[PDB]
């Protein structure tokens, strides 16, 4: 069975470095040509650079030559791909690829893909506030300005469970993180009811809470 | 450097529909190009090599051709494992490069009509001299839907950040869309407004300073 299996990858900062690697089976490397490929979220694929395991021969994209060396290795049937110089726009999924033998220039096998994020933006626990409400009403949480995600939001701490609805965050131009939660509730409850959401972001290590109240 | 063009970007298809996608080469290629599948998610799937070749194991309702620079695939009677985006790729010359993409679609069930609820600055924001308008959309199909933001009944173009649309668990889709202001900006206006249009459907919400 022929594999490719990738890994590294991960958020690195402008400038930064990375390596990532593909983990051949099924075949021998030193047989064909090992290939990156890229592909920037909600993008096309983007060729990025190319290694003939056997000789070493590499080749590399406009876009990549500098920063970026392709490597092999025999013994550990594997090859690599190290990073530097990194800038934003190398955000994207990484995948290995090879062609397939003699005259056979289709990429017939890929590994899985492993994510890589280039970003200037700081860890940075979010800034919470209640959305208050005006049969039913509609209040929420926002829950603005954190890097990376993710986040968890419940309420009640997991005991108030109909009628959430936790949105997608948008990635803002600034390069953080918002995204709101609401609760749909009976207008009797209002006043009345203890409405608390619980966020939580693991990558700062914070957890926040906030009551909301109707004005 | 040999450039692919992929027409068209998108296309909404019926389950037996027969289904053709095109890529023009900027230049001579001869028959060094392949086809591939794509899923949310996953790697991209080998469909057809050498522009006519079928690859293993791949249902022979797929089929590759070529005139000249512009190539074809097609897909005899859509099935819905054939949902998917497809990618062709010339191999001809280093770098190798792929079209930008043809997205193909389920041509969904009755629509759905968008929930839309706005609602305006926190004090908590307000207090540290920010303030965001927050425009949530959630339980509409399909998955495109056009935002507008006004202030008083002038359209405002500038500081919106709206999400593009996501499935929710129900299959429906989500968005988000933040306006972001300075309280003096709030105040300084009657209401504002966002406007969700959708399937020629459109809903308003508003929101006022003085209550």
């Known amino acids: 069975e022929v594999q490719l299996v990738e890994s590294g990858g991960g958020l690195v900062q402008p400038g930064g470095s990375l390596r990532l690697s593909c983990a051949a089976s099924?075949?021998?490397?030193?047989?064909?040509?090992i290939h990156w490929v890229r592909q920037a979220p909600g993008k096309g694929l983007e060729w990025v650079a190319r290694?003939?395991?056997?000789?070493?021969?590499?080749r590399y994209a406009d876009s990549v030559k500098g920063r970026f060396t392709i490597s092999a290795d025999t013994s550990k049937n594997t090859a690599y791909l190290q990073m530097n110089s990194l800038r934003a726009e190398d955000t994207a999924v990484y995948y290995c690829?090879?062609?397939?033998?003699?005259?056979?220039?289709?990429?017939?096998?890929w590994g899985q893909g492993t994510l890589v994020t280039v970003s200037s933006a700081s860890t940075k626990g979010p800034s919470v506030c209640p959305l208050a409400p005006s049969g039913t009403a509609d209040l929420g949480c926002l829950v603005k300005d954190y890097f990376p995600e993710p986040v968890t939001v419940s309420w009640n701490s997991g005991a108030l469970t109909s009628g959430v609805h936790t949105f997608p965050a948008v990635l803002q131009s600034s390069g953080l993180y918002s995204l709101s939660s609401v609760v749909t509730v009976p207008s009797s409850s209002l006043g009345t009811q203890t409405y608390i959401c619980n966020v939580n972001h693991k990558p700062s290590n914070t957890k926040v809470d906030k009551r909301v109240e109707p004005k | 450097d040999i450039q692919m063009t992929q027409s068209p970007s998108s296309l909404s298809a019926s389950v037996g529909d027969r289904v053709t996608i095109t890529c023009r080469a900027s230049?001579?290629?001869?028959?060094?190009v392949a086809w591939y599948q794509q899923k949310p998610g996953k790697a991209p799937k080998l469909l057809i090599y050498?522009?006519?070749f079928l690859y293993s194991g791949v249902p022979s309702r797929f089929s590759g051709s070529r005139s000249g620079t512009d190539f074809t695939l097609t897909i005899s009677s859509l099935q819905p494992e054939d949902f998917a985006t497809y990618y062709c790729?010339?191999?001809?010359?280093?770098?190798?490069?792929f079209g930008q993409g043809t997205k193909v679609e389920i041509k969904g069930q009755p629509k759905a009509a968008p929930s839309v609820r706005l609602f305006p600055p926190c004090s908590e924001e307000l207090q540290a001299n920010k303030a965001t308008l927050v425009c949530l959309i959630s339980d509409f199909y399909p998955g495109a839907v056009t935002v507008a933001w006004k202030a008083d009944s002038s359209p405002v173009k500038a500081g919106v950040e709206t999400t593009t649309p996501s499935k929710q668990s129900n299959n429906k889709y989500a968005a988000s869309s933040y306006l972001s202001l300075t309280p003096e900006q709030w105040k300084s206006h009657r209401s504002y407004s966002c406007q969700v249009t959708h399937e020629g459907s459109t809903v308003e919400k508003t929101v006022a300073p003085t209550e």
């Open positions: 690829s090879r062609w397939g033998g003699d005259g056979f220039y289709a990429m017939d096998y």
């Open positions: 099924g075949f021998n490397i030193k047989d064909t040509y």
């Open positions: 290694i003939y395991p056997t000789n070493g021969y590499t």
């Open positions: 230049q001579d290629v001869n028959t060094a």
């Open positions: 050498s522009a006519s």
């Open positions: 790729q010339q191999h001809y010359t280093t770098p190798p490069t």
